[PDB]
Design a protein around this nucleic acid. Sequence first.
DNA 1: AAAAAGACTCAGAAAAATTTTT
DNA 2: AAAAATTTTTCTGAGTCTTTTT
Length: 483
Amino acid sequence: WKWWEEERYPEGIKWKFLEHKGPVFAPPYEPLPENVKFYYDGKVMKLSPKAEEVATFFAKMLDHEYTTKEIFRKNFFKDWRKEMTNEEKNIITNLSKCDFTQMSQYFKAQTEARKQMSKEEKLKIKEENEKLLKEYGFCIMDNHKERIANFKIEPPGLFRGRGNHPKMGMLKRRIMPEDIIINCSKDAKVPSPPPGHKWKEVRHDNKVTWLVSWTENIQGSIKYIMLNPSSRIKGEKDWQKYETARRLKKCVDKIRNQYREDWKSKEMKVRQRAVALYFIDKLALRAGNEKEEGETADTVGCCSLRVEHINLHPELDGQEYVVEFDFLGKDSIRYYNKVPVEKRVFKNLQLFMENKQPEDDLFDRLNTGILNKHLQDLMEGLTAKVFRTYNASITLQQQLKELTAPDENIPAKILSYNRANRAVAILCNHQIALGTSKLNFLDPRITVAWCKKWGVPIEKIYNKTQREKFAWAIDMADEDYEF
DNA sequence: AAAAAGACTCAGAAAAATTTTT
DNA sequence: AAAAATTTTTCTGAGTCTTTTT
């Protein structure tokens, strides 16, 4: 169904009808075989069901060094006791006297056991799996069958944040139907909660896209279940995403001229803003929103850089006015880069950097909101993130341009393609991994044009899954598309 | 005015399928 | 074939940006 060949809905309205079967809850907990033992202070101790299970989580991760760290254990053990009966709380005073080995051994067993299984067994579980997909992996939005991305409820276990995360080891509880909110069209058949239960709520909100949600206990973040990238609802937003970035293309040099001018501004705020944008524009720096203390690991972005994240070098290794960046970004991915900037920028930074402590905010007097506000003014619907797309995609365009070899073999052209990709991955700082940018930053039409231009079969670049994702791009693109 | 809540994009790990060698 | 290597898929965490609320 070439949904791209249809009329987009008004703004706000996401669909008119929607019907799903709700989430597949995590299966029940089967207790350990009586032969599988736990010991506390070297004394066999059979645990309460809830307690046992939790111990199993830990027991199941015992080999990761994860389990050696202080936050993890502290976080872990605390939560576990909560799940203990009173009397258990009385005996297990600490985690250090617990023996999860028999527990650890057991599962490892189960592991290899599975890793060696009969082929028939291998197929039985696939057919099983497949059956699941047919039953809960699709929904009906408006007039068609659409696949649901994540239909399996998040299973209880131990929280695993990125980097030096303060909530590492905390227990994720089991989500009950009483925690789930259902989103569907009023006229649609309501999925029936499991026997003996009730949904938290059933809503019919067509301004949103999700079919189910609930709140994740450890961060209080709302989780959702939405459709597949192949969705119209998904593919449309993405097509629009790239559309916007091309609009930026069309007024980038203008915006640029402005900020360069603002560097000169009287009001320092205007200056911080402008420098900040310089970076975003030039280095592809993220917004850098203000994170809630103690909730996540310490990672910063453009607007949230603390003065200690950059080191100013009037000169270094040949170049002058070099900015040395060194911080952890989203997912705690490290950002390190020595950058020769405009003398003006450099000068502003010294100024932004004076009279402060290492922990102070470089661009104090500035935030993402302030930033984006100005951006939208410059261009309707313009945000810091648009810059990243624009850059990636535009970088891909020229790179492939200058790199694409006419007197080249398909095998050869593919590499040209992949190098052009590295350049992007490089700027986006994906760690090197071309996946993210290929999948989320590059206007696929660019790749479709190229394949066509160079008589290279899409199949050679895009995998099955990706093709389904970029089908719009695939079906509606000239050899002559130009981002 | 601002902060908390809400929703949707993008991120690498872990795992599972596939392929490629030995 | 085994087992090692690579690619694909699943998972859900981590941001951006928005809207509600106070």
